[PDB]
Amino acid sequence: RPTIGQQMETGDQRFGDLVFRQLAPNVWQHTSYLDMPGFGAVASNGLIVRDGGRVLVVDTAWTDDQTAQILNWIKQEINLPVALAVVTHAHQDKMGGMDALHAAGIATYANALSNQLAPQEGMVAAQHSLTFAANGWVEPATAPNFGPLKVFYPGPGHTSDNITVGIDGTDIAFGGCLIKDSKAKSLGNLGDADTEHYAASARAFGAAFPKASMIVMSHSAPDSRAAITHTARMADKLR
Amino acid sequence: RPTIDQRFGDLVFRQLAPNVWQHTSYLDMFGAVASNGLIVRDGGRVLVVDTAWTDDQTAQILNWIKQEINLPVALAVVTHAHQDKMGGMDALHAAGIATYANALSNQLAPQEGMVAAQHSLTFAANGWVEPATAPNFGPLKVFYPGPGHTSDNITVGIDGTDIAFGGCLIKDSKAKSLGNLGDADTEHYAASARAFGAAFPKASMIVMSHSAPDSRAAITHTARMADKLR
Ligand SMILES: CO/N=C(\C(=O)N[C@H](C(=O)O)[C@@H]1N=C(C(=O)O)[C@@H](COC(N)=O)CS1)c1ccco1
Ligand SMILES: CO/N=C(\C(=O)N[C@H](C(=O)O)[C@@H]1N=C(C(=O)O)[C@@H](COC(N)=O)CS1)c1ccco1
Ligand SMILES: [Zn+2]
Ligand SMILES: [Zn+2]
Ligand SMILES: [Zn+2]
Ligand SMILES: [Zn+2]
C-alpha cells in the first residue's frame, strides 16, 4: 500500500518486494517501491516485453536489489534471456538499478543526454546512447534490434532528457514520468522540469503514438489517452 | 507547485467563510508536499487548527494572522502527532499560544519527533471531547472518530459554518489511495471515517490535510477505500 502510486488490485502478482501486472499477452508492468522515512512508499513502474525468444525491459527499479528481483521474476515466469533494457531518464526511479542489469550481462540504452546527466546524479550511465531526429524519432542505427520498442523523444518536459516508448504490435505506449494520470492533481516533481515546453512535449508524445489506447506511466496505473490530454492541460498552466 | 489563493511568504491562504481561512504550507523533500490547516476568528480572538510543517512556517502563519486579522491568537488544536500537524509547536509556544492535542498525540509526540502540546484533550467513548479539557473553544467542536490514519487522529467541526476538518483521516473524493498508511489502523479506519461523517452531519465543506476542500463525497469515498483494507 504505497503512499504514492497505484495500489494492488485483481490482476497483480506480488513477487518479493515488487508487483507485476500483465497488460497484454507479451507485456507486463513491473512496479517497485522506495520507502521514504516518515512518508511511506513511492511506486515506480516500468515494462517487460516478450519478443519471440527474448525479453526487453523498459526502466530499472529504484535500486539494484529490486532490479535483480525483476530479473528473477523474468527467469521464473518467462524463462527467456533479457536482450536489452532502455531507461527513460536520469533519475533514480528509472536508472537506480543499472548495476544489476550490467552484472547480469544485459545491454543498456538511454538517451545520450541521460548518459551525460547520470553521473551528475550519482548514477551509472547506460552502456549505449540513443540519439534523436529533430522530430523526436530515435535514430535507428542507435537502436539496433529493438524489436517492438519504438523510442520517441517528445521534447523537454518532466526533464530535458525524458524519452518515451511505444510497443509496436500492441495498443500500448509508455510515457514514463512525463505523463501523469487523468485524475492527477499535479505534474509530480517539477524540480528538473521544463515548464515552458512541457505541454508541447506531452502533446508530441500523444501525436507520436496516435493509436495507443493504453498509456502506461511511472507513478500511476495504466490509463486512457485522457492521461495525455490531462497532463497537457495541467502543463498549459505552467506557461 | 508542490509534488503532492493568497501567497504570503512561503505559504498560501484561502478564505473559506467570513471567519475561516485555510492555511497551506510545503515541505520540500522528490519535491514539495502541501499540508492544510485552519484559522478561525471567534469573539475577538483567533483559533488555529494544526501547525505548518516547521517552526519557521508556523511563525509565518502567525505573521499573516497579524497582518490580515490583527487579533490575539488564543489557542491552537493540533490533530495528530505527525510533522505536517505538529512540526511548528515551538513557534506557537514562543508566541504565548495555548496548545491542545489528544492526550495520545502528546504521548506519541516525542517518539514521532514532535514537541507535545501543553494541554491534553480526552474523549468520551462516543468520541466527543470531554468539555472540561477544552475550555474556551468557541465554535470548535472536537471529535475523536477512532483509529484511522493514526491511532490518535482527531477532527474538528466549526459550529455556525458549513465546515468540518478531517485532517489526514479524510482523503478527497477523487483520491487513488489513503496516503501514508504506515501508522494506520486498517481494521478500524472505515468505521472511523464514517464516525467523522456522522459526528458532523451538517457539514457540506470537508477540509482535509492534503487536498483542496471537497464535498461530503470525500467522506464516502474515504470510507469505501478503507472498507477494502479489511
Ligand atoms: C535522482 O532521482 N532521485 C529520486 C527520484 O528519482 N525522484 C523522482 C523525481 O523526483 O523526479 C520520482 N519521480 C517523480 C515524478 O514526478 O516522476 C516524483 C514522484 O513522486 C510523486 N509522488 O510524484 C518524485 S519521486 C528520488 C529521491 C527520493 C525520491 O526520489
Ligand atoms: C512524523 O511525521 N513525518 C512526516 C509526516 O508528517 N508525514 C505525514 C504522514 O506520513 O502521515 C504526511 N501525511 C500524509 C498523509 O497521508 O496524511 C502523507 C501525505 O503524503 C502524501 N502525498 O500522501 C505522507 S506526508 C514526514 C516526514 C517526512 C516527510 O513527512
Ligand atoms: Zn524523474
Ligand atoms: Zn518519476
Ligand atoms: Zn499523519
Ligand atoms: Zn498528513
From Swiss-Prot, chain B:
Residues annotated for substrate binding in this entry: 171, 180
EC number: 3.5.2.6
Residues that, per the record, bind Zn(2+) 2: 84, 168, 210
Xref: CDD domains: NDM_FIM-like_MBL-B1 (cd16300)
Compartmental location: Periplasm
Chief site of localization: periplasm
Family: Belongs to the metallo-beta-lactamase superfamily. Class-B beta-lactamase family.
Protein name: Metallo-beta-lactamase type 2
Organism: Klebsiella pneumoniae
Organism phylogeny: Bacteria, Pseudomonadati, Pseudomonadota, Gammaproteobacteria, Enterobacterales
Name of the gene this protein is made from: blaNDM-1
